Amino acid sequence: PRSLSGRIVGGVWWFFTLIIISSYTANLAAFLTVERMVSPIESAEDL
Amino acid sequence: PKGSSLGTPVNLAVLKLSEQGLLDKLKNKWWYDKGECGAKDSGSKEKT
Numbered sequence: 001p002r003s004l005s006g007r008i009v010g011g012v013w014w015f016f017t018l019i020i021i022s023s024y025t026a027n028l029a030a031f032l033t034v035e036r037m038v039s040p041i042e043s044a045e046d047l
Numbered sequence: 048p049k050g051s052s053l054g055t056p057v058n059l060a061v062l063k064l065s066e067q068g069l070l071d072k073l074k075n076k077w078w079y080d081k082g083e084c085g086a087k088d089s090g091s092k093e094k095t
Contacts, residue, residue: 034093037094
């Protein structure tokens with residue numbers, strides 16, 4: 001129940017994992033965004 | 048040297064070189080072109 005001791009532990013640990021999974025999601029979005037940014041050499045100006 | 052013959056000639060030469068953008072060109076050649084760190088190129092590199 002409301003065991004304040006281990007209670008804040010579950011809360012802080014939750015806030016901890018929240019940040020991590022958010023970071024993973026954000027970063028993973030960037031790896032696909034940049035993956036598209038890489039434009040193939042279509043013309044000479046690209047070289 | 049004070050009161051030299053090359054005095055005036057060289058002076059004008061420097062002004063001529065700058066107006067022809069030759070001075071700016073030289074700097075770009077040894078500072079950025081010959082450089083090892085493309086700053087505007089590292090920001091243009093959308094792959095990192």
